[PDB]
């Protein structure tokens, strides 16, 4: 059984391995805009008295 122990130990060391694959992503952004954008103007002709 010493033989088995040693074989076990060697097998253990050699054997260890593992793989895995998955896809995930993390992202976060917060944009705060309290406004409707301006700088919007049509072409109109206006005049004042």
């Amino acid at each position: 059984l010493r033989k088995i122990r040693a074989a076990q130990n060697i097998s253990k060391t050699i054997a260890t391995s593992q793989n895995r694959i998955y896809l995930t992503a993390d992202n976060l952004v917060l944009n705060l805009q309290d406004e409707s954008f301006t700088r919007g103007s049509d072409s109109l002709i206006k005049g004042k008295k």
């Binding site: 944009n31 954008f37 919007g40 049509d42």
Partner: protein, 54 residues
């Protein structure tokens, strides 16, 4: 004991029992031999700013 019980169960369940136990085991063995896989996805997008038209 498990082996004894399995043998007993298969004996009762007949040959058909044994056969597909063998298949299950084969499936297990095959899985272990090659355990891995992935799933494919189509692309996601990223954020962007939307401008509303006037």
């Amino acid at each position: 004991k498990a082996a004894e019980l399995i043998a007993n169960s298969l004996a009762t369940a007949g040959d058909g029992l044994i056969e597909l136990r063998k298949l299950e085991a084969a499936e297990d063995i095959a899985y272990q031999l090659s355990r891995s896989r992935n799933i494919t996805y189509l692309p996601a997008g990223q954020s962007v700013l939307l401008q509303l038209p006037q």
